[PDB]
Structures are given as C-alpha cells and as structure tokens.
C-alpha cells in the first residue's frame, strides 16, 4: 500500500543526522527558535501536548551551547563565618586539581564537576522538590564543617548549561518564585530548605546558576503557571507553541522514515525495520493524528511502538522488524 | 542637576547610529527578535502600549531585508478570459522596460525600480480594497486589466507589511490576510466580477496591538503567528540607571535629527527630558518607554525654541512644552 517517498529495503539504509537538533522531526519553527535561543542564551517555554518531544528539544539546545568555558564550582570553609561557606568557580577540571592540592596538604568540596564534558550540561529537574532544585544543607564526635554539608541545586548543576523542567505549572508558587530570582541574578545561595533543622542556619555565598531554562508544559500551563515566571519568559525569552500534527504528505512520510531509523539507533538493541514495517508505523501515525489527512507528532507514543515491535522481533530471533511485529506491538496496548 | 552618563554641551555632539534597528531605545529583546525574524523571514506580532515605537520596529525590519531580489508586478490582458487578467513578476526596473517596449499594453501594478530598501507598507486602518486589492467600476469602456489596483499586501511583496491595531480589522479581512500569508499569493478581485490570477504577496507581517486588545484578533491569525512566527511582549519601562539615561540622550539626538526643523538641545534641556521620562514612567526608579509621547515633547520644545529664535533648545522650552498641550 503506502507510498513513503524514498526507496529502501530496511531502515539500515537511512542516514541519521549526528546532532539532536537535526533529529527533531516536524517542528521546524521550534527548531529554529531553539537555535536562536541557544545562540542568544535566552530562556524558553515549550508548550505542547504530552509525548511531543519537549525534553528532546531541551537536550538539543544543551548541545548547541558553547563548551569553551564550562566551570567547576567549589565550596570552601569561611573562617570569619562558619555558617556562610564561601564559593569559588574555576575552569572545568581545575576543580579536582584544587581538591588534590588541598588533599595533599579543611579541604574544599567540589559541588559541581564538569571535567571532561564535551557538551554543556542538560539537567532535568522535572518533579524536583525545593532542596533538589535550589540546593540544601544536610543535617549532620566533632560534627561536620558547614561547607562539607552544602548540596548543589539542580539550578547550580545547570550553570552554563540547560535546566529543563517539564510540567512547570506543577511546581509550587514559591519554587517558581525562587527560580525567577535565580534567573534574574544568575546566582543563588544555598541554604537548608527544612526550616527547623541545623541546615537552616547555613547560607552560603551566592552560587552561580547561569542556566538557560527550558520550561515546558501542556496547553493548560500558560494559564496555570506562576504569572511572574510567564512574564519573564515573554519579556526576555521565547514561548514556543509546538505542533501536534503535520499534514500527511510524501515529504512528511519521509520524515517518519527518518524517525524510525533514529529510534532504532537510539535504542541500540532492536533490529532495523523493513519498508513494510515502516509503512505500518505511518499507518499508525495516520490513525493517532486525531485528524484525517494528517500524521501525529505525538512521537513519544509512536516511539514506544517502534521499540515494542523491535522487542518482539528480537524475541523471535529476527534480522529485521516486520509488519507483523508492529501490528502485534499495537495490539499489545 | 541630573547625572546623564555623558559629557556634552548640546545634542549636536551626539552620535546617531546609521541603521534604524540600532536607533531603537530599550527594547533589547524586541530588537534581537526583529533581527532574527528578518533573517528567517518570519511574521511578528508586537504587543505593546500605544506610543511604544511599534512602527519604527517594522521599519527597521524592512531595512534588514534583502533588496537584491526585489520584483515589479505587471498585469496583462487575458485573451482566453478578459475577467481573469494575467499577472507577471519581473526583476525590479524591468517593469518599466516591458511597458516601454509595448509602447494592449501591460499595466505596471507595483514598481520597485530604484529601491534602496525593501518596502515598508503601512496598512494600519486600511479597508478591504486598499489592503487586498480592488478593481475600478458613446463609450467602448476600459479593459479589465487596466482597472486592477494592488493591495497593500501586493505592494509589500518581498517587504514588510505593518498593521497596527490588527485586532480592529474585520474577521474576514484577517482571514484573507491569513490566506495570503499561507499562499504567498492572493488574487485581486473587485470588492464592491473581475478576478485576476493570484498576485504575489510574500510579505513579512508585522502586526501590532495593545496588551488588553489583542486577544480579540482572529484566532487562526494568532495561531499562525504563534506557530510559525514571533510574539513580542514589549517593555513599557526601563530602570532608571545611568546606562539608561544615556540612551535617552541618544533618543533626544535622534528625534531632533528625524524632525529636521528644530534645534539641538542643551544638556540642561536633555535633563529635563529625563525628568519627564521619570515622571511618565508610573513606577519610581523607572523611565518611560512610551517614547512617542516623549518624542512629542522633544519636538514641541524645539518648536517653542524656534519661535524664540534660539540656537538651541533650553530647559525653559521643555517646561513650556510640557505645560502646553
């Protein structure tokens, strides 16, 4: 049946782009905004239905950011003031070295270590509670020096990379507020997030957190999320309204062919697909479009079908996934 | 008394950038969006309070667009079918050559010969016929192709179409705009039946509106902008810092130059413009970015200075302009 607009026996023949940004399928405007935003270092709110590739675009952005100047972040003891540990940032890999120098001679703690990175960090903070997001102070014989007890926030791990938070409206109003402050200042002090503990008394100097925020949410997020945060993104960043379907044309069929090829590669443990199995993934993309004459761009789900059919094929000892494998994978719910 | 972050005696000594996008004051994010949009050719909706320089950003965008490739648009008779006049485009200046070489003559519908920048077409307030195209209604009578008139949309072909208060256009005109944006061509037909073949209209739309009015615009137009282009939520104030005062000094210099018939301002007169900008801000520690009002004060003080025969505008001229209307 299906015309796919390229001639191939299996997806083994299909060339997959090296960089994540070039693998994004059917979101050309989001893609060109991500590149702009990576180039300018601007925050982004990605708005789209679930399963639409939001975390992938965030990862794709992190690969675009510069890696020349990544830093390590250390915390030192403060002799003048125990409960205000001092922070220092150095070029990546100089962290471990400073610890060594001092471990050879109170040694400072390496809070965030970016040694050897070939891409800027991508820090997924979806679901994070206050301590995990913003940093925390562990509650500890002589007892423990304050500075050893300092734990970095996701905001600090994301220093000079990307901080991705999906379902951003689900975060508490107070965490959306502290995130704003982190964005405004590009630094944020670490303190104990449990108010009654030994950690509430510790408050470090401000810790660098120059992240690009890639926030995301479904179509109801614009209304529900904290309005100050929405204003900051509209004011200085990019809201990206992501597509949910594309039109069923030959050029777009072709991109699903690439999609299949990319999913096999990313999985690494399933076989390539025969042309007829690919046609069946298209058949499914037609059906899930919730339109007529359109293809779905809810590709997470379609991704699950690719991977499930692959797994079936492997259980049968096959060299390639076949149409029967996809059909079985779909019936499997 | 105010500190300005620069030493000068009059705005005569103030450098003004050659390109319009560089003259824009205090809208750094709008500015980087307009550059991006001009580079990728994407439509833009500017959302800001009245007198916030929306039109100027439209104009700056037109300067950023390619001029190498501009085209003329001719309309021709259709022998097969009089009431579907035929449309041809040719590289700019060829238009006039083709009419001369025919001199039933083709009509030059849009002439861009000579252009130093891509056209900036301001269709704010325009009616269906003017925006979309029209045709005029012992005599032999005029050939149809000669009665065809271009819309603003066709005039903006390979340029910028600017529409302030886009939300006050009728829904049917917004829808026609949308169709035009989708197809990059639009037939000219009489709005009150001649119907030409599709007429090129590959414009970049710069739509503008106010925060509390824009939600009324046609939702399919807005979705197309949100889907394929850029929404910009313009600032309305900037913080009162030295670095921002300095930009107001540049503002005065630019406005003097643009007006062309008023004198340059003394430092003290420029301090008074800054005071006005503090008071028009609404928030303490801020400066207004409602620069159209502030611009009216600069030009009205200059006009007062001229009536007094002065070489430069002084602080008293600014105070009088501000008390005056």
Closest C-alpha to B223, from B163, B186, B181: B181
Closest C-alpha to B310, from B247, B264, B260: B264
Selecting from 1.10.10.10, 3.30.70.260, 3.40.50.300, 3.90.1150.10, what CATH number does the domain A1-241 have? Answer: 3.40.50.300
Residues of B within an 8 Å Cβ radius of A: 29, 32, 36, 40, 223, 226-231, 233, 235
| Record: contact A241-B223, CB cut-off 8 A | yes
Residues forming a β-bridge with B121? B161
Q: What letters, b where the CB count within 10 A reaches 16 and e where it falls short, cover B46-63?
A: bbbbebbbbbbbbbbbbb
Block residue for tokens 């739309």: B205
Provide the total of helices (H) and of strands (E) in chain B, helices listed first: 12, 14
User: How many degrees, rounded to 5, is the angle at CA A179 between CA A55 and CA A201?
Assistant: 130
* Distance of alpha carbon B306 from the chain centroid: 29
SS (H, E, C) A72-88: EEEEECCCCCCCCCEEE
Tell me which chain A residues have a C-beta less than 8 angstroms from the C-beta of B227.
Answer: 29, 241, 243
Closest residue on chain A to B236 (Cα): A235
For residues A123 and A126, what is the distance between their CA atoms, to the nearest angstrom?
A: 9
For residues B17 and B3, what is the distance between their CA atoms, to the nearest angstrom?
A: 23
Task: Catalogue the E-assigned strands of chain B.
Answer: 44-47, 71-76, 86-91, 107-110, 120-122, 134-135, 148-149, 160-163, 185-189, 195-200, 204-209, 230-233, 237-239, 286-288
Whether residue B276 contacts residue B294, with contact meaning beta carbons closer than 8 Å, is answered with: yes
Chain interruptions in chain A, by residue before each (C–N > 2.5 Å): 105, 140
Whether residue B201 contacts residue B152, with contact meaning beta carbons closer than 8 Å, is answered with: no
- Measure the N-to-C terminal CA separation of chain A; round to a whole number of Å: 25
Residue A280: φ, ψ to 5°: -75, -30
Block residue for tokens 């270590």: A113
Residue A274: φ, ψ to 5°: -70, 155
Tell me which chain A residues have a C-beta less than 8 angstroms from the C-beta of B30.
Answer: none
For residues B221 and A177, what is the distance between their CA atoms, to the nearest angstrom?
A: 33
Selecting from 3.40.50.1970, 3.30.420.40, 3.40.50.1110, 3.40.50.300, what CATH number does the domain B1-233 have? Answer: 3.40.50.300
Closest residue on chain A to B28 (Cα): A236
| Record: contact A241-B226, CB cut-off 8 A | yes
Say if residue A266 carries a ligand binding annotation: yes
For residues A109 and A104, what is the distance between their CA atoms, to the nearest angstrom?
A: 14
Q: What letters, b where the CB count within 10 A reaches 16 and e where it falls short, cover B294-304?
A: bbebbbbbbbb
Resolution in A: 2.0
Its CATH class, for the domain covering A242-333, is mainly alpha
Task: Catalogue the E-assigned strands of B42-118.
Answer: 44-47, 71-76, 86-91, 107-110
Block residue for tokens 């609404």: B282
Strand A109-112 to strand A294-296: parallel, antiparallel, or no bridges (unpaired)?
Answer: unpaired
For residues B309 and B244, what is the distance between their CA atoms, to the nearest angstrom?
A: 32
Residues forming a β-bridge with A206? A189
How big is the A-B interface in CB pairs under 8 Å?
22
For residues A3 and A24, what is the distance between their CA atoms, to the nearest angstrom?
A: 22
Whether residue A302 contacts residue A285, with contact meaning beta carbons closer than 8 Å, is answered with: yes
Sequence-distant (≥ 6) Cβ neighbours of residue B87 within 8 angstroms: B73, B74, B75, B76, B109, B196, B197, B198, B199, B200
Whether residue A30 contacts residue A46, with contact meaning beta carbons closer than 8 Å, is answered with: yes
Q: Tell me the Ramachandran region of residue A147: left when phi exceeds 0, alpha when psi lies from -120 to 50, beta otherwise.
A: alpha
Closest C-alpha to B110, from B42, B190, B174, B200: B200
Q: Dihedral sign for Cα A184, A186, A191, A193, please.
A: positive
Task: Parse chain B into domains and list their residue ranges.
Answer: 1-233, 234-325
Residues forming a β-bridge with A87? A75
| Record: contact B233-A235, CB cut-off 8 A | yes
| Record: contact B227-A29, CB cut-off 8 A | yes
Binding-site residue ranges of B for ADP: 25, 51-56, 228, 255, 258
User: How many degrees, rounded to 5, is the angle at CA A312 between CA A307 and CA A317?
Assistant: 120
Structure obtained using: X-ray
From the list B36, B231, B235, the residue facing A239 with the nearest CB is: B231
Strand B71-76 to strand B86-91: parallel, antiparallel, or no bridges (unpaired)?
Answer: antiparallel
Closest C-alpha to A155, from A179, A120, A185: A179
**DSSP at A136:** E
Whether residue B264 contacts residue B273, with contact meaning beta carbons closer than 8 Å, is answered with: no
Strand A203-208 to strand A187-191: parallel, antiparallel, or no bridges (unpaired)?
Answer: antiparallel
Q: Tell me the Ramachandran region of residue B75: left when phi exceeds 0, alpha when psi lies from -120 to 50, beta otherwise.
A: beta
Residues forming a β-bridge with B149? B134
Looking at chain A, list the stretches that DSSP marks H as alpha helix, in order from N- to C-terminal side: 20-23, 28-40, 54-64, 94-104, 130-134, 146-149, 154-157, 173-185, 221-224, 227-236, 250-267, 275-288, 299-315, 323-331
Show the tokens assigned to B4.
């300005």
Tell me which chain B residues have a C-beta less than 8 angstroms from the C-beta of A234.
Answer: 231, 233
CATH topology of domain B234-325: Helicase, Ruva Protein; domain 3 (1.10.8)
In 3-state terms, what secondary structure has residue B176? helix
Sequence-distant (≥ 6) Cβ neighbours of residue A206 within 8 angstroms: A87, A185, A187, A188, A189
- Distances in whole angstroms, Cα of residue B141 to Cα of each of B136, B137, B145, B146, B190: 12, 10, 12, 11, 16
């Amino acid at each position: 049946s299906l015309e796919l607009g390229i001639e191939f026996t299996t997806t083994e023949e299909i060339e997959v782009p090296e960089k994540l940004i070039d693998q994004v399928i059917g979101q050309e405007h989001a893609v060109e905004v991500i590149k702009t935003a990576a180039n300018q270092k601007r925050h982004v709110l990605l708005i789209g239905e679930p399963g639409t590739g939001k975390s992938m675009l965030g990862q794709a952005m992190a690969e675009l950011l510069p890696t020349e100047t990544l830093e390590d972040i250390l915390v030192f003891p403060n002799p003048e003031d125990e409960n205000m540990p001092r922070i220092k940032t150095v070029p990546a890999c100089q962290g471990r070295r400073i610890v060594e120098k001092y471990r050879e001679k109170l040694v400072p703690k390496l809070l965030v270590d970016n040694c050897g990175r070939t891409k800027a960090p991508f820090i997924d903070a979806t679901g994070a509670h206050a301590g995990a997001l913003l940093g925390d102070v562990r509650h500890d014989g002589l007892g423990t020096p304050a500075h050893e007890r300092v734990e970095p926030g996701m905001i600090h791990r994301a220093h000079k990379g990307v901080l991705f938070i999906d379902e951003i409206a689900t975060l508490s109003l107070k965490m959306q507020q502290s995130l704003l402050t982190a964005m405004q200042e590009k630094k944020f002090p670490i303190t104990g997030q449990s108010e009654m503990s030994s950690g509430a008394m510790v408050r470090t100097e401000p810790v660098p957190c120059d992240f690009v925020l890639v926030a995301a949410g479904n179509l109801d997020t614009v209304d529900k999320m904290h309005p100050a945060l929405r204003s900051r993104i509209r004011g200085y960043g990019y809201e990206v309204y992501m597509r949910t379907t594309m039109p069923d044309t030959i050029e777009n069929r072709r991109k699903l062919v690439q999609f299949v090829a990319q999913e096999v590669k990313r999985d690494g443990k399933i076989p390539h697909f025969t042309k007829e199995a690919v046609e069946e993934i298209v058949r499914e993309a037609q059906k899930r479009a919730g339109r007529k004459g359109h293809l779905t761009l809810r590709l997470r789900d379609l991704g699950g079908i690719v991977r499930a059919a692959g797994d079936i094929a492997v259980k049968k000892g096959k060299k390639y996934v076949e149409r029967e494998d996809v059909i079985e994978a779909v019936k499997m719910a």
